From a paper:
Ribonucleoside hydrolase C (RihC, EC 3.2.2.1, 3.2.2.2, 3.2.2.3, 3.2.2.7, 3.2.2.8) belongs to the family of ribonucleoside hydrolases Rih and catalyzes the cleavage of ribonucleosides to nitrogenous bases and ribose. IG–NH and IAG–NH are purine-specific hydrolases, RihA and RihB are pyrimidine-specific hydrolases (also called CU–NH or cytidine–uridine-preferring nucleoside hydrolase), while RihC catalyzes reactions with both pyrimidines and purines. RihC is one of the enzymes that are synthesized by lactobacilli in response to the presence of Klebsiella. The activity of the enzyme was studied towards a wide range of substrates, including ribonucleosides, deoxyribonucleosides as well as an arabinoside. It was shown that the enzyme is active only with ribonucleosides and arabinoside, with the best substrate being uridine.
The crystal structure of LreRihC was determined at a 1.9 Å resolution. There were four almost identical protein subunits (RMSD between subunits do not exceed 0.13 Å) in the asymmetric unit of the crystal, which belongs to the P21 space group. Contact analysis revealed that the protein is a tetramer in a crystal, which is in accordance with solution studies. The LreRihC subunit maintains the typical α/β fold consisting of 11–stranded β–sheet surrounded by α–helices. The active site of LreRihC is formed by the residues D16, D20, D21, N45, T128, N162, E168, N170, H237 and D238. Each active site contains one Ca2+ ion, which is coordinated by carboxylates of three conserved aspartates (D16, D21, and D238), T128 backbone oxygen and three water molecules. The analysis showed the similar environment of the cavity for ribose moiety binding formed by D21 (D14 in BanRihC), T128 (T125), N162 (N160), E168 (E171), N170 (N173) and D238 (D247). It is noteworthy that the side chains of D20 and N45 in LreRihC are oriented away from the substrate-binding cavity, in contrast to holo BanRihC, where the side chains of corresponding D13 and D38 might participate in substrate coordination (orange dotted lines). In the case of LreRihC, H237 (H241 in CfaRihC) has a similar orientation; however, H86 and Y226 (H82 and Y229 in CfaRihC) are located on flexible regions 3 and 2, respectively, and thus are far away from the active site, similar to the apo CfaRihC structure. Based on structural comparison, we could speculate that these loops as well as residues D20 and N45 in LreRihC, might change their conformation upon substrate binding, as seen in known holo structures. Region 2 (residues 226–234) is unstructured in LreRihC and BanRihC, in contrast to other RihCs, where this region is an α-helix.
Residue numbers in the entry:
A (entry chain B): 7 to 226, 233 to 308
B (entry chain D): 7 to 83, 87 to 226, 232 to 308
C (entry chain C): 7 to 227, 233 to 308
D (entry chain A): 6 to 85, 87 to 227, 233 to 308
Write the structure that this text describes.
């Protein structure tokens, strides 16, 4: 048996590393990749997902999704224009075409086709919120959501908020209230998931995949974000977790905050997320190299 | 010329009267009816739209839409149709095998120009504009039942359709498509008189049907039908272009906040707000239109 | 045999008419007038209150209060600059001085001196919020608050909000949550309290007070009267239709300054914090206004 | 040879007791006044606790009791026994009485008496918000506010919010928008300010002050020290890493009580209102704490 997964992404170098591990691990069956707009437009994140899938010679379908957040106007200060949004390696132009259907339509069809799937959002959550609103019947087919985003110890857009949640707080609130079990892979662990200078050097000489990932990773040691959704699916024993109630702040100066009820004081003992609080960084490094060494 | 219109509804007696006028006026071509959940489930509002369309012998397609608001949990306040006072029978046909969003996307992209007429909460319109922003250049305007600039009905601050899905209303009001706001400011003045309702019941089969719905619960304020009355008789309304914001949290959740002084938005407007109505002409019009029907 | 009252004001022509009726009614004992900043700064509203009290020759102390709202920055487009903020009559320049103490300190001393008082806020509620936070012991001495402000049917700063609440929504929230009984005299009644052209003509020829009030009333220019309806409520509650309900104050977002009435009683388990004024006998308001001013200087 | 004039607003509290100990006894500091606010115990009990500490050192530095409740946010009753709120030592019953005036009134008089003072709030900020609203004239007399509270890396009431800000977010917003320079002594540094087992053992054997502080510090089973870091900042700012930034207070929603730092300087046109403490020399904090207490009774 393989675990059926669907990835919703805004590649993005971090998403490229997540997709690399998901595509190549033989215990995972990646059914579908959807994209959302982020630091580049949905047209560019779509092209980037196609570039990674084509690099591995796979025919995994890509569906382009939401061009904008539900409500929060996208910060143009965060919008890179006339660039790829996934720099540091030449993929060529031979990478194929997305589906004609939207990410929401593709998610609905791919989820309803499976008894059980794990959904893995590594961008802002706009497509997931739209999916759950238009097709709430998908939820019984989803075992778990393993989401990159949030922080319980300090943000990156402000002190209070992490990028994926901050980009579409309203979509994050819909996802966090949907009643599907969530694993929160936030900055609490991703800032600890330090790919060492020694690991990054070894990566660049390993094979064509290692050369590609080295190019993306070194373009700007490196904390790895989105790839920890896949590392959690394969090695949950590498993480320390805590079940808690998570609320999304959707306005005011703390817009985009993932607020954890760390005391369990306010929600009558109810939880909606398994929050990732720590990671084995040594095993993450060993794992990352072991996995890439088996690829092209 | 005929105006192409698409109606998004939660029938509902008020939506029944709106659909009746839209179906039967020869200057309007109703391409599609979509439904949303409200006082009753999306399954029941879908059945109610199909009952009205079938009553006039039309095969106007119905697509069932959103079962719940985007964010705000629906206030539960069993057994009921949600459109009582007339027996439509069995045999009213079936919805499309796609969502309201998918049906709206296909029907709007097939036309150069359409008018969109939401008479429920705005969930399907917000989902449509988020998933398919390419529809917006095909929409001349939105003529929306909802809001109030002079006192609400769910609270003092908020009208039902906006209150039910404030987040969807915000998405619709920020989408850049021209809006006409048909709020409580005019619908509470659109009083169908006791004399009108009596004449309606004896007029014909449509009059009998509308009489049955209208009198199920002296005179009745009519809501959603004023979107169609606006399309056909804009001269019967007093309007003011203004900036409208949607309050989406706090005690004033669901408020349509009009910048009545134009103090806060650098003179920009996103809505033509209906502030008054010729109630006498509304009554005369309502009877004249129904007299031409079955 | 007199009702002890304290007025917190931002005069303002409407507050001048309220103070006029309160000073001159023999069933009322106006112990103190406090001021808050509004369309003009607190120094100007203080001067305006002193002008009205000095016009009637009374001993009534004035204490200057808050210069700014608690939290919401005062909208500069609503600030009237290099002006009195009470135009249409020259009182001269011999109107006396405020107390040395703040409005809050003067309110605390005047309320604690009475077993029972009625508080009558006709500006924004900044002083009352500060008072209840610093000296919650005053609340057992207050029989009720009769407040000018709010709307349950359309605002004047936006469609959602009335000026006095809009000006300091956080102060209004503190006041509305304080557990002192409130009567809300909002735009629902004040926009119906239309002083007719016939009344305003008769007012100007009545006596010195009528001449002074005519000067203030007709400076911009029939006229809706606001703040004076707090005093008309105290003297003639039979002139009003009221409804006890739960009122929340919106303190942020586009509906900032909204008084939200739970008109269905759906959300508060049947609890009430305000008696909301919904209708007024405008004919009696006119008759009363003329009858009262005819008994003055 | 010259002293810094300071005023402390406190809710003692073991952490405030340690802050007051250092402030009372440092020869470069002149503590003019202590005010109190309600927190984990009532304002009556925090007042008693400040008087106990002052009396322990043979001083009669005045204490003025302040606000009994937050401005707006109902006090979380799960966060309020027949308990002192400062256990682990018998201070006896000879500790004297607070001033008759409120904290606000005492703060206004003490600040206006000085050309320059530093204000040091170690509780929730209710008294400071009321002070700045009623007496904005104090602000030109205040060089700086050195505040215990906030976090830019994880809270203690929720993931988003620290206790002092969470307790009265509205008061914290008024303080952060008042235009007086702020030094933020948040959980970023106070959770690193670990008084070691070795330090706490040496403290207990040092003298009567060390015995008293040992009693309070070891009552609940090193120890992170909070409020005392305001005084450690005043004396040894070189022991801290700071960054000027714009700080907003979240006053509603699930992130209520958050101190939101514009860490990118993306949203406020490069304007700052706070010098945020991000790191501390914990080794020097320990050395300093022992050196200071060794010079006391
Ligand atoms: Ca990403
Ligand atoms: Ca769709
Ligand atoms: Ca409807
Ligand atoms: Ca005071
Ligand atoms: Ca006034
Ligand atoms: Ca403290």
């Amino acid at each position: 048996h393989t675990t059926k997964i669907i990835m919703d992404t805004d590649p993005g170098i971090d998403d490229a590393a997540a997709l690399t591990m998901a595509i190549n691990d033989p215990s995972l069956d990646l059914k579908l990749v959807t994209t959302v707009a982020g630091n580049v437009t949905a047209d560019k994140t779509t092209a980037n997902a196609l570039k990674i899938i084509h690099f591995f010679g796979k025919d995994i379908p890509v569906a382009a999704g939401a061009k904008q957040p539900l409500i929060k106007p996208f910060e143009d200060a965060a919008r890179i224009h006339g660039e790829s949004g996934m720099p540091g390696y030449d993929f060529g132009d031979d990478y194929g075409k997305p589906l004609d259907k939207t990410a929401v339509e593709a998610l609905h069809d791919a989820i309803m086709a499976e008894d059980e799937v794990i959904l893995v959002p590594t961008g802002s959550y706009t497509n997931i919120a739209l999916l759950f609103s238009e097709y709430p019947e998908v939820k019984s087919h989803i075992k778990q959501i393993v989401a990159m985003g949030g922080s319980f110890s300090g943000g990156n857009m402000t002190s209070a908020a992490e990028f994926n949640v901050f980009t579409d707080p309203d979509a994050a609130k819909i996802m966090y209230n949907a009643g599907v079990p969530i694993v929160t892979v936030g900055l609490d662990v991703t800032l600890k998931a330090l790919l060492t200078a020694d690991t990054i050097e070894k990566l660049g000489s390993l094979n064509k995949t290692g050369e590609m990932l080295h190019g993306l990773i070194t373009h700007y040691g490196r904390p790895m974000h989105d790839v920890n959704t896949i590392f959690y699916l394969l090695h949950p024993e590498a993480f320390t977790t805590k079940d808690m109630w998570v609320d999304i702040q959707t306005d005011g100066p703390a817009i985009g905050a993932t607020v954890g009820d760390i005391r369990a004081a306010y929600h009558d003992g109810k939880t909606n997320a398994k929050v990732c609080l720590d990671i084995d960084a040594e095993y993450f490094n060993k794992w990352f190299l072991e996995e890439v060494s088996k690829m092209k």
